[PDB]
Amino acid sequence: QVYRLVAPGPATPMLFEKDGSSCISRRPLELAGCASCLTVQDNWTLELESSQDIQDVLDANKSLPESSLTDLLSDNFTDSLVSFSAEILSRTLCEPRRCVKLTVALETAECEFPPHLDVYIEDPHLPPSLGLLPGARVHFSQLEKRVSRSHNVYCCFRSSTYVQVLSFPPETTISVPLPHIYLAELLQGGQSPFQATASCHIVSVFSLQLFWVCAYCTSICRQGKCTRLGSTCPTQTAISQAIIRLLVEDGTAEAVVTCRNHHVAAALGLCPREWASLLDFVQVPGRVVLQFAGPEPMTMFLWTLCTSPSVLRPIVLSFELERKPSKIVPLEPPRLQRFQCGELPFLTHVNPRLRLSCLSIRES
Amino acid sequence: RCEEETPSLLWGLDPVFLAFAKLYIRDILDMKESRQVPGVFLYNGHPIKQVDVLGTVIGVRERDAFYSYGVDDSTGVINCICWKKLNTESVSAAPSAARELSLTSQLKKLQETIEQKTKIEIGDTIRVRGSIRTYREEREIHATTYYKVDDPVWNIQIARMLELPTIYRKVYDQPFHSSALEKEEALSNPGALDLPSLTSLLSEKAKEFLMENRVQSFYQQELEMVESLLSLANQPVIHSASSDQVNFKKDTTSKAIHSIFKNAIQLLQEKGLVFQKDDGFDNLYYVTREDKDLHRKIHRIIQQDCQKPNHMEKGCHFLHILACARLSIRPGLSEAVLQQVLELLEDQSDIVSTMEHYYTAF
Amino acid sequence: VDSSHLPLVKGADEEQVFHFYWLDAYEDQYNQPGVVFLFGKVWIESAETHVSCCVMVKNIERTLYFLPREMKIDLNTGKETGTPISMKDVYEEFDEKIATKYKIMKFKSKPVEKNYAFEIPDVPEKSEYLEVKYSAEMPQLPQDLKGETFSHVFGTNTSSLELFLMNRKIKGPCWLEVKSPQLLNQPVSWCKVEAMALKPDLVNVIKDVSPPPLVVMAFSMKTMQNAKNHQNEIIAMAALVHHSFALDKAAPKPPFQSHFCVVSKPKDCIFPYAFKEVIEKKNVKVEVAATERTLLGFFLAKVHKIDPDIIVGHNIYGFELEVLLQRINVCKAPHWSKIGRLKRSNMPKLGGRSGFGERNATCGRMICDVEISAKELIRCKSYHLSELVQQILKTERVVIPMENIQNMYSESSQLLYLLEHTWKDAKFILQIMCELNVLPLALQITNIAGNIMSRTLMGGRSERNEFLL
DNA sequence: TAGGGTTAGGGTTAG
Structure with a gap:
């Protein structure tokens, strides 16, 4: 916008050129030796001009500047100032360094599958500005960008940050179905989505783990007793956890899928009562770990179940790429293996496997 | 022209190689075997190793070691050998505790369910997965996994028949994989197509030349003397894009050559391989790898944990090391130069890195 | 020890040579075919001690042996054509067919005599064979290659290390002499001293020095x-x-x-x-x-x-x-x-x-x-x-x-x-x-x-x- | 200073 200073008083020259050294003139610590300073006075006021008068200057009221996606997602980018427009997805409060972690989905006209990003708001500014709610569209300007230990990209909140709210959250949260793709499209690096569904068929199982951990110190329990009880936990509370690593394909490509918690019971095709009985049985020794491939009636039952055609069944899987879009580390060259079909081993160049994560598993 | 098959080294790059392909039985019977390796077939250039079929059983034959079936998919009839898994050393049940007794009962129920699922007669519907083989001039599928599909309304086969043409059109009727794209190796002779690409190739060519000679210091005009680098840079693209002067054609060509060399040198400086000093020479550069004194100073600084207190946790962060070096050695130090110095120091077994962007002394 | 100079020792013929005592050997045909590495200790005069050294040997040539047929037999029909078999005929058939098909630009051939006394039948005890030598870069011929003059071929898949050890008469760890070593601009080993020999013929055996510590x-x-x-x-x-x-x-x-x-x-x-x-x-x-x-x-x-x-x-x-x-x-x-x-x-x-x-x-x-x-x-x-x-x-x-x-x-x-x-x-x-x-x-x-x-x-x-x- | 720990696993025969 174009603002006009309408400071009243006598027509004293130089008053709009520089701050008088001998008069009232103070500067912030970050502006100690500035060549141009003009302190505003209390009696001074501001006004807004019309559009027609300054249409030439106001013709530059295009979209606010936004850094290129390549600049934003490159670690070699030494500049630590970025700006973008995004839509807030979820807001959470972090407590011990008080932080309000924000998850924003970018909006750009370059890539039709914008990546996700995290914005952290720390203590110096923590009456966070009004309007920062899930579902709204907000424009962030001049954020600090840093690369973490795990090569992730996240934007901090510095004293030179300007935040403007554009649209309010919708009254009704409409639903959207995930796209339906083949698993081969993710191996072609041209604009592929990272959250879709596919009709895969289970092939094998790599491992399976079941625990009974302590609710406070997250240590393996035995009959509802912490191993370090009396030193790290004040009560006797036990919760269950489960991991599994499938290996699915859908007629075009191969991928390995990791599932957690109740998705384990969903993938195994077990009723809730059977799942509860299995967990109760597991509660006795404390842990059950099986490594079918990779570097007791319960064991035999699990081994039989993991190879029967009751598990290796066609399913419909809604998956999310394990490597987050923010992460940047392309360093994988093709490998070389020794497949042998007709008693005549040969050598081929193979690509690294696709790693996924489960969100929902349904039968068909 | 006889279409030469894809080389046997690039077969694994195709995603279809490791996936159970859905194909018509007529296609399975009609594909041509590959001469390079028997047992692996070709369909439109795609190296297909495994198949997936669904059909109606029309004939059951049993031998002492394997079953035989005929799968009809309304397009053709093929055999499907199903091997017999030996039930040697059957699990012995024992009258254990009540929970273990329930587990054994559930195991017996699961075994009965599996045995019911694997029972097949004439007229049923079967799904067979496995690999193609040739035996006595006959093509057949050696099944890996197979079970009887319970389809009482004929929805699964209808869905399969509706789905197969779409998968064919969108995947199988496509040219080939992407192995080093198309002439990604080199740039189709030093002429190339993109002028910045020419600048980049000249840049790391000059970098390689400087490394191989073990150059300590060099000048841009010295790099201009190199006939090989000049010949590599002398391409139609730069000459055609530098015709901004008529009376000074040679002069403007030399100026464009100087500009492209400066761009290459600044690209190298961005990587930190070469660093500059304020010695009055605008084109004087020193190779970072050969600066032994900088390595010694950095190692000496690290050995004291950047003058941090001993009770403070040993080691330093990358930013802390950079700040200490800037305040102590030279304010003009760049991050890339420091990173290269640290990597070179670690290569010679001088420092050990504990976390990422964290380094400690021995 | 500086890497700009090698601890060369003057020989009997007034020529400086490399002396070392090899212990272990490594070969990698998939990445660098025709290359065999040697490791060992080399005496250093500056410190009067021994340090690790790596020696690189390049240009190892494969060897193939062909058995001429007694009477010419057509490949397509498996029947005689009415002409005898001569060594020049075998050479001409090889040059006209195998080199063209398998892209073998450079090779050397000469008639040799060899003996066979092993389990493979259809091989005479004593005969004359065709020895063809070419670098490892060209693709390996199939083990079951059969032609109009040669029935069986030997030496198709001989490893470079085995050939180098066999043809230089090296028996375990022993002192070696390398003639005309060349410095390496790019280090490839963690050892102190590096050198490479252009051809395998530049390595001999010395048998008069006790092993070092x-x-x-x-x-x-x-x-x-x-x-x-x-x-x-x-x-x-x-x-x-x-x-x-x-x-x-x-x-x-x-x-x-x-x-x-x-x-x-x-x-x-x-x-x-x-x-x-x-x-x-x-x-x-x-x-x-x-x-x-x-x-x-x-x-x-x-x-x-x-x-x-x-x-x-x-x-x-x-x-x-x-x-x-x-x-x-x-x-x-x-x-x-x-x-x-x-x-x-x-x-x-x-x-x-x-x-x-x-x-x-x-x-x-x-x-x-x-x-x-x-x-x-x-x-x-x-x-x-x-x-x-x-x-x-x-x-x-x-x-x-x-x-x-x-x-x-x-x-x-x-x-x-x-x-x-x-x-x-x-x-x-x-x-x-x-x-x-x-x-x-x-x-x-x-x-x-x-x-x-x-x-x-x-x-x-x-x-x-x-x-x- | 901001993702938990992290890496990679099955790749064959029997008539």
Whole structure:
């Protein structure tokens, strides 16, 4: 916008050129030796001009500047100032360094599958500005960008940050179905989505783990007793956890899928009562770990179940790429293996496997 | 022209190689075997190793070691050998505790369910997965996994028949994989197509030349003397894009050559391989790898944990090391130069890195 | 030692030559075909000692043998055509068909006479063969190639290392002389001195110098098992190093001259109170590592700096080397190749049943497992470490179960006792190795057989006798 | 200083 200073008083020259050294003139610590300073006075006021008068200057009221996606997602980018427009997805409060972690989905006209990003708001500014709610569209300007230990990209909140709210959250949260793709499209690096569904068929199982951990110190329990009880936990509370690593394909490509918690019971095709009985049985020794491939009636039952055609069944899987879009580390060259079909081993160049994560598993 | 098959080294790059392909039985019977390796077939250039079929059983034959079936998919009839898994050393049940007794009962129920699922007669519907083989001039599928599909309304086969043409059109009727794209190796002779690409190739060519000679210091005009680098840079693209002067054609060509060399040198400086000093020479550069004194100073600084207190946790962060070096050695130090110095120091077994962007002394 | 000059020694013909004593050889045809590496010690006049050296040999030529047919037979029909077979006919057919089909631009041929007395039939006892030699870069011909004049072809898949060893009459570790060495601008090995020979013909054998002393290290480590993924981690390890271990007399006394120890902590527990102060008061050279990655980096740096030639221990190949490689991969410790001598990027596949990748993981060095040597040498009730100590040295050894390992971090005294126990175990392993004279016996066996020295320690008697034959 | 720990696993025969 174009603002006009309408400071009243006598027509004293130089008053709009520089701050008088001998008069009232103070500067912030970050502006100690500035060549141009003009302190505003209390009696001074501001006004807004019309559009027609300054249409030439106001013709530059295009979209606010936004850094290129390549600049934003490159670690070699030494500049630590970025700006973008995004839509807030979820807001959470972090407590011990008080932080309000924000998850924003970018909006750009370059890539039709914008990546996700995290914005952290720390203590110096923590009456966070009004309007920062899930579902709204907000424009962030001049954020600090840093690369973490795990090569992730996240934007901090510095004293030179300007935040403007554009649209309010919708009254009704409409639903959207995930796209339906083949698993081969993710191996072609041209604009592929990272959250879709596919009709895969289970092939094998790599491992399976079941625990009974302590609710406070997250240590393996035995009959509802912490191993370090009396030193790290004040009560006797036990919760269950489960991991599994499938290996699915859908007629075009191969991928390995990791599932957690109740998705384990969903993938195994077990009723809730059977799942509860299995967990109760597991509660006795404390842990059950099986490594079918990779570097007791319960064991035999699990081994039989993991190879029967009751598990290796066609399913419909809604998956999310394990490597987050923010992460940047392309360093994988093709490998070389020794497949042998007709008693005549040969050598081929193979690509690294696709790693996924489960969100929902349904039968068909 | 006889279409030469894809080389046997690039077969694994195709995603279809490791996936159970859905194909018509007529296609399975009609594909041509590959001469390079028997047992692996070709369909439109795609190296297909495994198949997936669904059909109606029309004939059951049993031998002492394997079953035989005929799968009809309304397009053709093929055999499907199903091997017999030996039930040697059957699990012995024992009258254990009540929970273990329930587990054994559930195991017996699961075994009965599996045995019911694997029972097949004439007229049923079967799904067979496995690999193609040739035996006595006959093509057949050696099944890996197979079970009887319970389809009482004929929805699964209808869905399969509706789905197969779409998968064919969108995947199988496509040219080939992407192995080093198309002439990604080199740039189709030093002429190339993109002028910045020419600048980049000249840049790391000059970098390689400087490394191989073990150059300590060099000048841009010295790099201009190199006939090989000049010949590599002398391409139609730069000459055609530098015709901004008529009376000074040679002069403007030399100026464009100087500009492209400066761009290459600044690209190298961005990587930190070469660093500059304020010695009055605008084109004087020193190779970072050969600066032994900088390595010694950095190692000496690290050995004291950047003058941090001993009770403070040993080691330093990358930013802390950079700040200490800037305040102590030279304010003009760049991050890339420091990173290269640290990597070179670690290569010679001088420092050990504990976390990422964290380094400690021995 | 500066890398701009090589320790050349003047020869009898007033020509400076390279002299060294090779120990182990490595070959990699998939990446650099026709290249064989040699490692060993080279005398240095500046310090009057021996340092590790790497020698590169290039341009190894394959050899093929063709058996001419008695009477011409058409390939298409398998019937005679009415003409005899001559050597020039075989050469012309080869040049006109095989070179065109398999893209063999350059080759050398000459008539030779050879004998065959093996199980393959349809081969005369004595005949004349066609010997064709060409570089390894051109593709290998099929093993079952048959033509209008040659029925069977030999030497299709002969490894470069075997050909180089056979054609130069090298019998185990022996002194070598290299004529006209050339410096390498790009280092490829971790050794001090590097050189390369253009052709294999520039290497000869000298048989008048006693073997030089080597460097030997014995090490052991303690591994605790994680309770959530059944993975084995590393908590502490120790080693002992000798610098002048001879190979032609009794073991030196004392068996060791220097040692080091490093102790780490698990992810959950912390060190006992004032553990650093306790260590300092006792005045014992024990280095504390913050994490497992620090421990692995320190161990690799110590291995690289000490530069050992022979590494010994108990149950290395089966368990310890695999565990160490897995931990290096998981912790993403950089520069894993320091455990060997040749710069490599891609770690070989782990978990191999035959252990071929695990065996190749330490090319250029020596891995001596006391278990296999004990099995080959003497008979005992069992080959566990405690039983071996009881039967050989007649001493009692304490066994620490995995259950107490978690509890040893309660007090500093328990941690010191565990570290001392590991040190004593390493010392016992070294003493057991020195007792049986494993190294001189292995050297004598290798010299008699003539095979590679490193393969002798693997117990492959069939390999040694195959090489001898 | 901001993701938990992290890496990589099956790749063959029988008539």
